[PDB]
Amino acid sequence: ARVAVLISGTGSNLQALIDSTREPNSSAQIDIVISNKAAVAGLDKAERAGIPTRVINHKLYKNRVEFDSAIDLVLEEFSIDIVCLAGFMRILSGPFVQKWNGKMLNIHPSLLPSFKGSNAHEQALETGVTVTGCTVHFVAEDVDAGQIILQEAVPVKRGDTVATLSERVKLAEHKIFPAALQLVASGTVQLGENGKICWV
Numbered sequence: 001a002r003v004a005v006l007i008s009g010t011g012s013n014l015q016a017l018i019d020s021t022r023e024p025n026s027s028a029q030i031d032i033v034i035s036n037k038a039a040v041a042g043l044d045k046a047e048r049a050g051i052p053t054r055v056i057n058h059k060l061y062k063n064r065v066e067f068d069s070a071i072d073l074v075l076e077e078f079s080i081d082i083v084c085l086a087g088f089m090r091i092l093s094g095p096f097v098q099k100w101n102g103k104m105l106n107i108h109p110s111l112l113p114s115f116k117g118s119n120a121h122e123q124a125l126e127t128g129v130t131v132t133g134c135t136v137h138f139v140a141e142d143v144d145a146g147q148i149i150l151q152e153a154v155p156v157k158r159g160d161t162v163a164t165l166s167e168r169v170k171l172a173e174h175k176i177f178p179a180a181l182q183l184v185a186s187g188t189v190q191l192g193e194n195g196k197i198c199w200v
């Protein structure tokens with residue numbers, strides 16, 4: 001299966017996916033990395049690994065639909081089967097999501113359905129949980145509401161900050177994102193016709 005990874009920043013999840021998809025038994029290959037932001041570290045990681053990159057400045061299109069259309073054109077250019085959102089911090093439009101339904105994965109740094117949105121760690125700390133974690137899910141139109149593929153729990157330690165908690169949770173993210181991608185790329189897991197997760 002041919003994979004695009006979309007990023008907005010550092011790209012530690014991208015690197016974990018690069019590492020995993022290069023293992024001999026990987027059912028996935030990463031063929032393109034797309035960023036909505038210029039000059040971010042994730043682009044350096046892609047270039048270092050010999051993977052093509054494209055930057056699509058969302059600040060250059062009239063609306064969300066046109067921006068997503070620009071992404072989709074690149075996806076078609078590289079004959080992509082599966083899209084991974086790996087620190088990609090934009091909401092995707094309905095038609096784009098529907099087109100890629102069952103073929104687009106996202107990593108989110110909480111145990112969904114808790115702490116949806118862009119600041120999950122802040123929320124977890126404010127709420128006072130002692131267990132948080134991360135989630136890989138299929139992307140649906142409603143944000144962070146799509147079908148869950150894998151999750152991993154991570155403890156919150158007394159005195160944690162976004163810095164120390166995000167660091168601990170990223171260790172787990174780097175485990176479950178590669179595992180989830182392999183499950184989908186191998187056809188082991190798919191989005192079921194009834195909308196529910198199907199272990200084939």
Ligand SMILES: Nc1nc2[nH]c(CCCCc3ccc(C(=O)N[C@@H](CCC(=O)O)C(=O)O)cc3)cc2c(=O)[nH]1
Binds near residue numbers: 085088092094097106
């Ligand atoms: N349909 C759909 N789309 C999705 N996207 C993601 C991944 C992101 C999830 C969290 C999130 C939420 C909101 C925002 C935000 O307001 N972003 C600004 C740009 C901010 C900037 O560029 O500086 C924007 O969209 O314009 C950013 C991040 C998951 C997911 C999903 O499950 N369903």
Ligand SMILES: NCC(=O)N[C@@H]1O[C@H](COP(=O)([O-])[O-])[C@@H](O)[C@H]1O
Binds near residue numbers: 008014088109170173
């Ligand atoms: N709402 C989605 C969200 O918060 N995503 C989070 O952004 C970080 C990206 O780090 P990376 O660029 O090092 O992969 C990761 O922690 C990812 O789960």
